[PDB]
Design a protein around this motif. Structure first.
Motif, PDB file in Angstrom:
ATOM      1  N   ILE A  98      13.575   5.343  -3.759  1.00  0.00           N
ATOM      2  CA  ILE A  98      13.672   4.986  -2.368  1.00  0.00           C
ATOM      3  C   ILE A  98      14.545   3.735  -2.300  1.00  0.00           C
ATOM      4  O   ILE A  98      14.423   2.847  -3.143  1.00  0.00           O
ATOM      5  CB  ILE A  98      12.268   4.771  -1.759  1.00  0.00           C
ATOM      6  N   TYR A  99      15.439   3.696  -1.315  1.00  0.00           N
ATOM      7  CA  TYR A  99      16.315   2.567  -1.097  1.00  0.00           C
ATOM      8  C   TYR A  99      16.702   2.348   0.379  1.00  0.00           C
ATOM      9  O   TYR A  99      16.673   3.299   1.173  1.00  0.00           O
ATOM     10  CB  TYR A  99      17.586   2.753  -1.894  1.00  0.00           C
ATOM     11  N   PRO A 100      17.118   1.106   0.722  1.00  0.00           N
ATOM     12  CA  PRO A 100      17.490   0.778   2.084  1.00  0.00           C
ATOM     13  C   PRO A 100      18.922   1.100   2.379  1.00  0.00           C
ATOM     14  O   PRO A 100      19.808   0.923   1.541  1.00  0.00           O
ATOM     15  CB  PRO A 100      17.247  -0.731   2.162  1.00  0.00           C
ATOM     16  N   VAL A 101      19.134   1.602   3.586  1.00  0.00           N
ATOM     17  CA  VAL A 101      20.458   1.750   4.171  1.00  0.00           C
ATOM     18  C   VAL A 101      20.338   1.210   5.583  1.00  0.00           C
ATOM     19  O   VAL A 101      19.559   1.738   6.401  1.00  0.00           O
ATOM     20  CB  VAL A 101      20.877   3.224   4.251  1.00  0.00           C
ATOM     21  N   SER A 124      39.985  21.614  -9.559  1.00  0.00           N
ATOM     22  CA  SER A 124      39.565  20.449 -10.344  1.00  0.00           C
ATOM     23  C   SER A 124      38.311  19.691  -9.821  1.00  0.00           C
ATOM     24  O   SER A 124      38.208  19.335  -8.651  1.00  0.00           O
ATOM     25  CB  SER A 124      40.730  19.469 -10.465  1.00  0.00           C
ATOM     26  N   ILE A 125      37.376  19.424 -10.720  1.00  0.00           N
ATOM     27  CA  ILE A 125      36.216  18.613 -10.408  1.00  0.00           C
ATOM     28  C   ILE A 125      36.552  17.126 -10.537  1.00  0.00           C
ATOM     29  O   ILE A 125      37.464  16.731 -11.270  1.00  0.00           O
ATOM     30  CB  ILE A 125      35.039  18.980 -11.328  1.00  0.00           C
ATOM     31  N   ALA A 126      35.833  16.296  -9.797  1.00  0.00           N
ATOM     32  CA  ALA A 126      35.990  14.859  -9.939  1.00  0.00           C
ATOM     33  C   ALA A 126      34.701  14.120  -9.572  1.00  0.00           C
ATOM     34  O   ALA A 126      33.691  14.750  -9.283  1.00  0.00           O
ATOM     35  CB  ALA A 126      37.176  14.384  -9.117  1.00  0.00           C
ATOM     36  N   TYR A 127      34.701  12.791  -9.647  1.00  0.00           N
ATOM     37  CA  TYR A 127      33.494  12.017  -9.263  1.00  0.00           C
ATOM     38  C   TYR A 127      33.897  10.991  -8.236  1.00  0.00           C
ATOM     39  O   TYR A 127      34.854  10.247  -8.442  1.00  0.00           O
ATOM     40  CB  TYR A 127      32.816  11.310 -10.446  1.00  0.00           C
ATOM     41  N   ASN A 128      33.158  10.949  -7.130  1.00  0.00           N
ATOM     42  CA  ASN A 128      33.540  10.112  -6.005  1.00  0.00           C
ATOM     43  C   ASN A 128      32.590   8.953  -5.884  1.00  0.00           C
ATOM     44  O   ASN A 128      31.386   9.155  -5.937  1.00  0.00           O
ATOM     45  CB  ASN A 128      33.494  10.915  -4.696  1.00  0.00           C
ATOM     46  N   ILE A 129      33.137   7.745  -5.773  1.00  0.00           N
ATOM     47  CA  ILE A 129      32.376   6.602  -5.311  1.00  0.00           C
ATOM     48  C   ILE A 129      32.334   6.591  -3.769  1.00  0.00           C
ATOM     49  O   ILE A 129      33.367   6.540  -3.105  1.00  0.00           O
ATOM     50  CB  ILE A 129      32.992   5.277  -5.755  1.00  0.00           C
ATOM     51  N   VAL A 130      31.112   6.609  -3.254  1.00  0.00           N
ATOM     52  CA  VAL A 130      30.783   6.533  -1.871  1.00  0.00           C
ATOM     53  C   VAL A 130      30.317   5.128  -1.488  1.00  0.00           C
ATOM     54  O   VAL A 130      29.544   4.473  -2.212  1.00  0.00           O
ATOM     55  CB  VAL A 130      29.679   7.541  -1.555  1.00  0.00           C
ATOM     56  N   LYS A 131      30.795   4.673  -0.335  1.00  0.00           N
ATOM     57  CA  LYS A 131      30.396   3.380   0.204  1.00  0.00           C
ATOM     58  C   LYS A 131      29.850   3.528   1.609  1.00  0.00           C
ATOM     59  O   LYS A 131      30.467   4.161   2.449  1.00  0.00           O
ATOM     60  CB  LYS A 131      31.600   2.480   0.215  1.00  0.00           C
ATOM     61  N   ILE A 132      28.695   2.934   1.850  1.00  0.00           N
ATOM     62  CA  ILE A 132      28.068   2.889   3.167  1.00  0.00           C
ATOM     63  C   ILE A 132      28.003   1.417   3.568  1.00  0.00           C
ATOM     64  O   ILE A 132      27.423   0.576   2.841  1.00  0.00           O
ATOM     65  CB  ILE A 132      26.653   3.487   3.139  1.00  0.00           C
ATOM     66  N   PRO A 133      28.597   1.075   4.723  1.00  0.00           N
ATOM     67  CA  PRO A 133      28.629  -0.337   5.112  1.00  0.00           C
ATOM     68  C   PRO A 133      27.287  -0.836   5.592  1.00  0.00           C
ATOM     69  O   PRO A 133      26.358  -0.057   5.787  1.00  0.00           O
ATOM     70  CB  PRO A 133      29.635  -0.359   6.257  1.00  0.00           C
ATOM     71  N   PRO A 134      27.150  -2.152   5.756  1.00  0.00           N
ATOM     72  CA  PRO A 134      25.874  -2.625   6.342  1.00  0.00           C
ATOM     73  C   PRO A 134      25.718  -2.246   7.833  1.00  0.00           C
ATOM     74  O   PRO A 134      26.672  -1.751   8.455  1.00  0.00           O
ATOM     75  CB  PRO A 134      25.939  -4.145   6.180  1.00  0.00           C
ATOM     76  N   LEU A 135      24.538  -2.477   8.399  1.00  0.00           N
ATOM     77  CA  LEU A 135      24.347  -2.301   9.840  1.00  0.00           C
ATOM     78  C   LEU A 135      25.263  -3.242  10.627  1.00  0.00           C
ATOM     79  O   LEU A 135      25.350  -4.423  10.311  1.00  0.00           O
ATOM     80  CB  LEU A 135      22.904  -2.556  10.237  1.00  0.00           C
ATOM     81  N   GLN A 136      25.969  -2.700  11.618  1.00  0.00           N
ATOM     82  CA  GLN A 136      26.866  -3.473  12.474  1.00  0.00           C
ATOM     83  C   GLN A 136      26.177  -3.761  13.804  1.00  0.00           C
ATOM     84  O   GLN A 136      25.053  -3.321  14.034  1.00  0.00           O
ATOM     85  CB  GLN A 136      28.148  -2.687  12.747  1.00  0.00           C
ATOM     86  N   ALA A 137      26.871  -4.500  14.672  1.00  0.00           N
ATOM     87  CA  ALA A 137      26.361  -4.880  15.997  1.00  0.00           C
ATOM     88  C   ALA A 137      26.030  -3.665  16.881  1.00  0.00           C
ATOM     89  O   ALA A 137      24.939  -3.618  17.463  1.00  0.00           O
ATOM     90  CB  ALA A 137      27.353  -5.792  16.695  1.00  0.00           C
ATOM     91  N   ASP A 138      26.933  -2.674  16.938  1.00  0.00           N
ATOM     92  CA  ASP A 138      26.676  -1.407  17.668  1.00  0.00           C
ATOM     93  C   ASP A 138      25.361  -0.708  17.293  1.00  0.00           C
ATOM     94  O   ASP A 138      24.909   0.189  18.012  1.00  0.00           O
ATOM     95  CB  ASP A 138      27.844  -0.409  17.522  1.00  0.00           C
ATOM     96  N   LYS A 139      24.777  -1.080  16.151  1.00  0.00           N
ATOM     97  CA  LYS A 139      23.486  -0.534  15.709  1.00  0.00           C
ATOM     98  C   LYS A 139      23.534   0.957  15.351  1.00  0.00           C
ATOM     99  O   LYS A 139      22.491   1.560  15.103  1.00  0.00           O
ATOM    100  CB  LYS A 139      22.409  -0.762  16.773  1.00  0.00           C
ATOM    101  N   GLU A 140      24.732   1.545  15.331  1.00  0.00           N
ATOM    102  CA  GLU A 140      24.917   2.949  14.946  1.00  0.00           C
ATOM    103  C   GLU A 140      24.624   3.166  13.448  1.00  0.00           C
ATOM    104  O   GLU A 140      24.786   2.251  12.632  1.00  0.00           O
ATOM    105  CB  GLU A 140      26.347   3.413  15.264  1.00  0.00           C
ATOM    106  N   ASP A 141      24.204   4.380  13.110  1.00  0.00           N
ATOM    107  CA  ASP A 141      23.771   4.742  11.758  1.00  0.00           C
ATOM    108  C   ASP A 141      24.876   4.472  10.743  1.00  0.00           C
ATOM    109  O   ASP A 141      25.951   5.080  10.825  1.00  0.00           O
ATOM    110  CB  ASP A 141      23.408   6.224  11.705  1.00  0.00           C
ATOM    111  N   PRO A 142      24.627   3.551   9.783  1.00  0.00           N
ATOM    112  CA  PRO A 142      25.679   3.257   8.800  1.00  0.00           C
ATOM    113  C   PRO A 142      26.151   4.472   8.010  1.00  0.00           C
ATOM    114  O   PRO A 142      27.321   4.521   7.618  1.00  0.00           O
ATOM    115  CB  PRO A 142      25.023   2.215   7.882  1.00  0.00           C
ATOM    116  N   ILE A 143      25.286   5.464   7.826  1.00  0.00           N
ATOM    117  CA  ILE A 143      25.683   6.675   7.107  1.00  0.00           C
ATOM    118  C   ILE A 143      26.842   7.391   7.787  1.00  0.00           C
ATOM    119  O   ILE A 143      27.719   7.928   7.131  1.00  0.00           O
ATOM    120  CB  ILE A 143      24.508   7.644   6.896  1.00  0.00           C
ATOM    121  N   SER A 144      26.882   7.361   9.107  1.00  0.00           N
ATOM    122  CA  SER A 144      28.022   7.942   9.828  1.00  0.00           C
ATOM    123  C   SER A 144      29.322   7.174   9.571  1.00  0.00           C
ATOM    124  O   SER A 144      30.395   7.688   9.899  1.00  0.00           O
ATOM    125  CB  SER A 144      27.753   8.009  11.336  1.00  0.00           C
TER     126      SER A 144
END
Ligand SMILES: NCC[C@@H](O)c1cccc(OCC2CCCCC2)c1
Ligand SMILES: NCC[C@@H](O)c1cccc(OCC2CCCCC2)c1
Ligand SMILES: CCCCCCCCCCCCCCCC(=O)O
Ligand SMILES: CCCCCCCCCCCCCCCC(=O)O
Ligand SMILES: [Fe+2]
Ligand SMILES: [Fe+2]
Lengths: 510, 510
Positions: A121-124, A183-203
């Motif tokens: 379990i982790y925070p986003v 071709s297969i590859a490996y992706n680094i994914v980045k999710i930003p912190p919560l912003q002022a708009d309060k919209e879901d960082p995952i989006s």
């Protein structure tokens, strides 16, 4: 050395029931006043559906656990996570979704990938997510343990899955890795912190950088990765996923195979310029599940790892029928298993052709080496930090918030004795000194480090572990609080019910 | 860690003169009454001929040294060995014979191979021979240090050379290894003990078994090998001798090259059935000079080694100009050198195809592994016994007479700090505990173990080392006697002259 003939560890793999509301634990010793917050952990809690068994350690249905330090008492609570897997099983009274090592039998819809979030379990942003290693994570309520929703990362970014060990920066920024198509590859994914708009960082998720794969159609299994302020480290091991067999009775285990000739390929990427660095770091074969910590030291990355020597997939040894055997048989079953070893690898960043044939690791306090070959591969040998016969230092934790990605001295770990968890360990990675907490017929969980709010030193804080102690004259489980200086006991919070095995978790300060 | 800014170690590489007859040493502390006999050691003692310098550590002219414990006093004596190399140099007042790293310039006869016996001394029958690593050994008188004769092993058996580390059984039987022609190959040579006829055992030399070579025309450099009651162990490293360049300004160093892709190949032979066993043991690249000990444990050989991680030839770092530099420069010169490490390898003897892909090392007290691959190679990983940054445990010795080739617990070694000898070390190979003897501005030699005649335990005895201590208010050298239990000092026998570096030797009991 230490023996468990009574077979108490079997309780780790026994079904339990969820609770309606929190139990009050009985405290022995004294809980520091500064320790307020909640320990949240995940693990399997349901090992069969009616008369249909789950077979593998990673198949049982996700159970979310919480120890709450509040108002001068400690409570314990647990709830099953209402995943599709669990809800459909409870509805149909059978195994409906195929788990890692348990094929579901039927009774156009597309392949139904498990969302059994039993691992971590982790925070986003302001949210918490339980996860396994698929494309499905489950938002949960950290106070009540209610399940809020399922999320499909494939709706947001291009990965097929993601590890249960994202790295989280101090601002809340989340990095993870998953395999993809390139071709297969490996992706680094980045999710930003919560912003002022309060919209879901995952989006706002995005792909930062892509690592190449050693085999066109076979990605390696990836369980974790390394992150420093300036670099991303990815270790490609010889445990491969056969995508051919994947897309054609089968479970996830059946699709794995070991590559006998590749060894381990190590990869780095510039975090800030978002680019792969084409240095061909190479070493001997090992399985890797957990990175301990990674940091930069002059023109070198220091990469500390919990390794399993060999290319045979260690998960082959983790079927429940084997973990439930009597002790003499448990030992015998681990005789030909990969040997656990903590290793420090040192990756040169400033590679000069004129040093072809020599050891590039010029740092003064290591015995790790890296040899530049004429074919331009860099052949690594490790400095060994910890090594005991069939005695693993695993599930490692550090003082993450302040020392993650940085020079450091201490790691904490769960000691596995022929795959049975039976001790807690602290390692000084510079001197190799260790400290151990162990009691007979007591099977602890990953140690989680919590820093003192006024810490001056790296190990000013406590270590928390959930312990199962099935013995005859015993409360069956307890939360253990140790002083991180020397693993001496500070307090226990006992409960009168069993607690099955848990994998990972966090301490949420309050 | 420990520093030598005064540069005292330079004295190790300074010419000395021989003595006309023994000096009486001055004893401090108390020499055990049971210690009677002679310590004989070899090393270079003449580092230039007039104004012509020798360049490499292995080039100086052989000097034979003796510390004699007799009649309640200790004497010290040394004489140059009257080899062809030394006698022709003294006659012609120049370098006449090409040494390892010093080409002789002239001033039909065939190539003149050096017989500069500076490395070791060992018994054959009732005789003693000084040696280097060529086909020439020199019979010497152990009482007087007179040179008796030159012997050419090529007159007796088919090898081109032989190591300076023969193994000697308790009956006096001598085993050695050298490369030969088979295609190149490596021959185990056996010399029987002295028989009733009293004829020279060397004339009864024979070839026992032959090991194959990884490269048709390039033998590896071999410095030592392993012997147990039932097996012979040979480790083929990537330091190769280029025979092409050999038989066409040149010295011996110029003919060496490193193979970057082979790693290390390990080989065993059945000692008693005199046959090569075709198990393809494989591991990572390292230089190897000294085996520590080898023994059998159920269906496995335990192979303990002093390794140097990498394929670059460690002798590249041992030119005299580099060893004579100031301390900051000595350290800097070792920055890219191979890292020393003591390793335990475990070789499975009973290989079952059905275990393809698994770790065959089922022993309970090791973390070494051996993986059977589908190509039938067996990939080894070591258990690390000792590892310090640029701090080598080298010139290893054990309680040889009773534990050579057998299960054992203790090794003694010379500690090298960036190639400078500055400590003596005892290692428990089971627990990895160490004990160290060190004093500032004191540069010791290989420790030689002498057993108490009534020993009950493996380490009941003493350790002898010759120490150079050039400091201002000091006798310049001494024989050091330590208790083997803990390396505490028992006595010194001081002398008022310098003693240059020595490599190997023996204690001859009397
Ligand atoms: N932490 C132990 C493994 C477990 O989380 C697990 C349970 C269920 C499925 C699964 O899948 C891993 C797959 C990633 C995508 C490619 C196939 C393997 C992994
Ligand atoms: N112990 C250090 C090496 C030294 O004994 C030495 C000195 C002089 C020559 C020599 O030759 C080794 C050769 C064996 C035959 C093939 C070429 C290398 C070796
Ligand atoms: C927590 C103790 C479980 C008993 C079995 C322990 C054997 C673990 C072997 C190392 C594999 C680690 C993978 C599990 C962690 C994870 O799923 O993230
Ligand atoms: C005896 C101290 C000498 C100073 C240089 C020490 C560096 C030795 C490095 C290991 C190589 C051992 C080879 C020499 C022994 C031998 O000739 O048999
Ligand atoms: Fe994990
Ligand atoms: Fe030697």
């Amino acid at each position: 050395q230490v023996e468990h003939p009574a077979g108490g560890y079997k309780k780790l793999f026994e079904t339990v029931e969820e609770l309606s509301s929190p139990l009050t634990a009985h405290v022995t010793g004294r809980i520091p006043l500064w320790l307020t917050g909640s320990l949240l952990r995940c693990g399997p809690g349901l090992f069969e559906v009616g008369s249909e068994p789950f077979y593998h350690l990673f198949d049982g249905q996700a159970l979310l656990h919480k120890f709450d330090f509040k108002e001068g008492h400690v409570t314990y609570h647990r709830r099953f996570i209402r995943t599709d897997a669990y809800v459909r099983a409870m509805t149909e009274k059978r195994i409906v979704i195929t788990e890692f090592g348990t094929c579901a039998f039927p009774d156009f819809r597309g392949v139904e990938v498990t969302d059994n979030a039993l691992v971590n379990i982790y925070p986003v942003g302001e949210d918490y997510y339980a996860c396994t290693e698929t494309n499905f994570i489950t938002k949960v309520n950290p106070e009540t343990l209610e399940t809020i929703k399922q999320v499909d990362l494939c709706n947001y970014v291009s990965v097929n899955g993601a590890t249960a060990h994202p790295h989280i920066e101090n601002d809340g920024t989340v990095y993870n890795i998953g395999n993809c198509f390139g071709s297969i590859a490996y992706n680094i994914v980045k999710i930003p912190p919560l912003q002022a708009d309060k919209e879901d960082p995952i989006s706002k998720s995005e792909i930062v950088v892509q690592f190449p794969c050693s085999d066109r159609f076979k990605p390696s299994y990836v369980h974790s990765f390394g992150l420093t302020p300036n670099y991303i480290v990815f270790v490609e091991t010889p445990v491969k996923i056969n995508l051919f067999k994947f897309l054609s009775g089968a479970n996830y285990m059946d699709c794995f195979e070991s590559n006998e000739t590749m060894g381990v390929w190590l990869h780095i990427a510039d975090k800030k310029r978002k680019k792969y660095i084409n240095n061909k770091y190479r070493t001997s074969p090992f399985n890797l599940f957990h990175h301990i910590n990674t940091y930069e030291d002059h023109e070198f990355l220091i990469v500390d790892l919990c390794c399993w020597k060999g290319f045979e997939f260690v998960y082959n040894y983790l079927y429940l029928a084997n973990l439930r055997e009597n002790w003499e048989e448990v030992k015998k079953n681990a005789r030909k298993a990969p040997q656990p070893e903590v290793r420090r690898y040192v990756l040169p960043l400033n590679i000069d052709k004129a040093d072809t044939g020599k050891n590039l690791v010029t740092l003064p306090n290591t015995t790790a080496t890296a040899i530049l070959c004429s074919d331009e591969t860099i052949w690594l040998e490790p400095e060994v930090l910890f090594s005991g016969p069939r005695q693993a230092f695993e599930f490692p934790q550090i003082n993450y918030q302040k020392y993650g990605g940085k020079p450091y001295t201490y790691a904490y770990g769960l000691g596995l004795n022929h795959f049975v968890p039976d001790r807690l360990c602290k390692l000084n990675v510079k001197t190799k000194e260790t400290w151990v907490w162990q009691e007979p017929d007591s099977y602890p969980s990953e140690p989680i480090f919590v820093s003192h709010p006024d810490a001056l030193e790296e190990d000013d804080g406590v270590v928390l572990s959930v312990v199962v102690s099935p013995g005859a004259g015993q409360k069956p489980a307890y939360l253990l609080i140790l002083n991180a200086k020397d693993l001496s006991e500070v307090a226990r919070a006992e409960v009168e019910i069993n607690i099955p095995v848990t994998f990972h978790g966090l301490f949420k300060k309050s």
